[PDB]
Design a protein around this ligand. Structure first.
Ligand SMILES: CN1C(=O)c2ccccc2Sc2cc(NC(=O)[C@@H]3CCCO3)ccc21
Length: 129
């Protein structure tokens, strides 16, 4: 049995905002994401979930909006965010996707929670708008 196809990759390069996040904030969040990427518990979240490699045919039926650290980093670099809260939203989406599919009690979900904790701690220092 086949499941749903992989959604189009983000960002939609066709709907960027003309007023992205100022460079000072964007530079801070980019450095924050790179810091998370160096976390050893971030390894599974570096790249998009590979539903064929992981043999989870229905992953996209349950997770219609996948997210991962490389997509967040690309959305910052390509100027796709309008507000730092959207960065936090995408990080939360990555974590919620993981818990939704794998269950709150799975090891991978604990790793998701741990890198979310690091991310939030770093974000405490984000410069104002
Ligand atoms: C977050 N997440 C998952 O949410 C996920 C989704 C479905 C099935 C298993 C998992 S654990 C998981 C594993 C990898 N990657 C690996 O385990 C690597 C690549 C294949 C085996 O080592 C990447 C993402 C991921």
């Amino acid at each position: 049995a086949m499941g749903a196809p992989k959604p189009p990759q983000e960002p939609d390069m066709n709907n960027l905002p003309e007023n992205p996040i100022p460079q000072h904030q964007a530079k801070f969040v980019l450095n924050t994401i790179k810091a998370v990427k160096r976390n050893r518990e971030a390894v599974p979240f570096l790249h998009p979930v590979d539903t064929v490699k992981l043999n989870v045919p229905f992953y996209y039926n349950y997770i219609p909006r996948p997210m991962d650290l490389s997509t967040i980093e690309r959305k910052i670099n390509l100027k796709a965010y309008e507000d730092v809260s959207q960065v936090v939203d995408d990080f939360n989406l990555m974590v919620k996707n993981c818990k939704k599919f794998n269950g709150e009690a799975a090891g991978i979900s604990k790793m998701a929670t741990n890198i979310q904790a690091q991310f939030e701690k770093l974000m405490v220092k984000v410069p104002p708008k």
